[PDB]
Structure 1
């Protein structure tokens, strides 16, 4: 299980499920038919968001990693 893993893996995780469901409600609000899992993950923004969660869970948590994680969530949620 996940409690046994000694190293966090983003794939098939709560973070990937939460951000994936969040991005599907955003498409329905915009009335768009772009509802493909592979396409969403491919985007660069997701790559930066999954690099920040894997650094907070594994590496030491500092104020520099909470600000890098914040910028990656402001691009996915269009929070300019």
Structure 2
């Protein structure tokens, strides 16, 4: 199980599931019918978000990893 894993893998994780769901709701709010899993999870922004979450989960948490995570989430949620 994921509890047994000693290395965090972003694939099939709660992070991937939660960000996917959030992005789908955002698309529905814009009335866009592009709901393809692959496209949504293939954007560069998702790659930055995936990298940030993996660092936080696998490496020592510090103020710089939290700031990197903040900026990645702000881009995916269109918060400026």
TM-score bracket relative to the smaller structure? over 0.9
Following superposition, which runs of at least 4 residues in structure 1 exceed 6 angstroms of deviation?
Answer: none
Distance 2:42 2:17 in 1: 15
Unpaired runs of 5+ residues, structure 1, are none
With normalisation by structure 1, the TM-score equals: 0.99
TM-score (norm 2): 0.99
Q: CA offsets per residue over residues 23-47 of structure 1, 9 Å max, x none?
A: 0000110000110000011100000
Superposed CA RMSD: 0.4
Cα shift readout 1:18-76 (whole Å, capped 9, x = no counterpart):
00000000011000011000001110000000001100010000000000000000000
